[PDB]
Design a protein around this ligand. Structure first.
Ligand SMILES: O=P(O)(O)O[C@@H]1[C@H](O)[C@H](O)[C@@H](OP(=O)(O)O)[C@H](OP(=O)(O)O)[C@H]1O
Ligand SMILES: O=P(O)(O)O[C@@H]1[C@H](O)[C@H](O)[C@@H](OP(=O)(O)O)[C@H](OP(=O)(O)O)[C@H]1O
Ligand SMILES: [Cl-]
Lengths: 313, 313
């Protein structure tokens, strides 16, 4: 009777309506660091107004000093070494660049770009294998070819930018390993809740980690996907902390807020409304997964548990 | 000794530096007519101040009534039908759409676009054969594909525009024949003086026209290349008219002035300067070709004559 369960709404959208049409500039490389850079060691600041939170609530910091995670937006290669260098002061563990982007991206002549389709959905519906093969094929195709690279402006369309003939092409994995970071890819679709596949892959990965591993999450802006995986990591590693505290603290170090709040979008942005609501419900559902399955050591994965414990809108 | 004779400066430029990167919007289709629409039967207007001409000068109209030519910018299909209907009111002869554009262009869902490279030079150096081959391959490749079409804005780079999955592809040949016009293509490079190859093709074409043929020339903006062939036609068919009159009258009906004038360029447009100067010289040289070959019936092709009678800087 149910075509798309809650948590899988994006499956109803049609990928053929969002195919990539331009190399989008992911970071202009002007600053020393990527945007929205934050670490779990950072001091808590006031909530953003739009979330209508209790400014005076002080969330527990239980486990934060030990969390060892960070988040950021996309970066140039120089910016990533600066990140790696900053993080290397805080740990002697391996540092992972955890790349949460389903969209095909890489570096053309050291410039960080992505193949941008409407809503950033150019790889919508593809398996991780298919997404990455596309990415590799496209990047290789750009070498010694003329390309147009532009930032998005008015109404999410190209505005200015530049044209060049590319002399070097790199994957983010190459750039990460050049900055001394290990690399882990989770192909998560922009704007929406990560898929069961996304999270099963993340959970098995998390399970292989040495104790002193530091996880640096990033996506395009370092907001939606980055925060979702920061929050999930926090819940997994610190299961005795309350839902509310996890969400308050991940927001107040510079993340998105993943609890209820009054959503009011502009008209041309109202397609986002139900995707926000979906993420809120799924955040609660993941919390529940952790509480019920951590005891036995996660004998049953998220994808399976969720099919027998469907979320409700 | 001499690497590139006058008339062939553009041959020294390197094609690989101007390769196409975007589907440019050739006309937004808001007006009923293309821009710079004019006919050889129009009233003369005041010259443009930037050319510092004698506004009191009354050029001879000898032969203009019989000249039967027109010019305009690029157009949508509906705009072309409007052009064809207006011209049909002036003549009962065959009406020609003379397409002077070297750049690859056509129509996607009826939208006039072109494959734009910097300086509009994406087909620089190609034979007319190779250029049309590029055009056919690109137009066809766009069918059922997602494309980005954009007007150029600041600094000749894409600004805004639209994204669509293309359901229909046509050549300008198709669009012209659909509007009741005969089609003739001369692949002339934007900004520069037409090659001897271009001019030879046009002269052989001119020599096969019925007496009542009406030539509608057009290029991207209907200024540079369009005026050059309107002027050439005026000289071939009205050989007894003075260089000065021709140039004055072709400007005063709405064309470019192809005589000497104080060139005032911007900085980012100083690359233009020598190409303007080249054209003024080659215009005079063509006139000389007309005068010296009007008598033996144009036995001698422009390209061979020009090689023995090279023009000087
Ligand atoms: O790429 P990430 O790190 O997942 O972050 C998202 C990304 O920057 C999107 O482009 C953005 O959409 P908009 O440009 O439409 O804001 C979205 O904001 P929103 O969904 O909160 O608007 C972010 O959450
Ligand atoms: O396509 P056509 O009819 O040959 O007309 C030319 C075309 O519009 C060029 O883009 C334009 O250069 P700009 O974009 O630099 O103006 C040039 O003007 P200019 O060479 O007089 O500047 C025109 O002559
Ligand atoms: Cl199971």
């Amino acid at each position: 009777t149910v075509t798309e369960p809650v948590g899988s709404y994006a499956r109803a959208e049609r990928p053929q309506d969002f195919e990539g049409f331009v190399w989008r500039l992911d970071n202009d490389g002007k600053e020393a660091l990527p945007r929205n850079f934050r670490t779990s060691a950072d001091a808590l600041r006031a909530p953003e107004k739009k979330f209508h939170l209790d400014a005076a609530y002080v969330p527990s910091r239980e486990g934060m000093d030990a969390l060892h995670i960070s988040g950021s937006s996309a970066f140039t290669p120089a910016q990533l070494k600066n990140v790696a260098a900053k993080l290397r002061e805080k740990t002697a563990g391996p540092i992972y660049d955890v790349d949460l982007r389903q969209e095909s991206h890489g570096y053309l002549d050291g410039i960080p770009v992505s193949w941008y389709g409407e809503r950033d959905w150019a790889n919508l519906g593809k398996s991780q294998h298919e997404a990455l093969a596309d990415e590799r094929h496209r990047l290789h195709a750009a070498l010694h070819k003329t390309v147009y690279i532009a930032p998005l402006g008015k109404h999410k369309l190209p505005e200015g930018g530049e044209v060049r003939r590319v002399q070097k092409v790199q994957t983010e994995q190459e750039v990460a390993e050049a900055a001394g970071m290990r690399y882990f890819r989770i192909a998560a679709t922009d704007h929406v809740w990560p898929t069961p596949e996304n999270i099963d892959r993340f959970l098995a990965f998390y399970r292989t980690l040495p104790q002193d591993a530091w996880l640096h999450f990033h996506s395009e802006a370092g907001v939606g996907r980055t925060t979702a995986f920061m929050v999930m990591t926090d819940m997994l590693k610190n299961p005795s902390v309350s839902l509310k505290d996890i969400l308050y603290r991940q927001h107040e170090i510079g993340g998105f807020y993943y609890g209820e709040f009054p959503i009011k979008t502009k008209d041309k942005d109202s397609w986002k409304t139900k995707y926000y609501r979906e993420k809120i419900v799924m955040i609660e559902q993941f919390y529940r997964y952790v509480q019920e399955n951590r005891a036995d050591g996660y004998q049953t994965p998220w994808s399976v548990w969720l099919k027998s414990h469907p979320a409700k809108a």
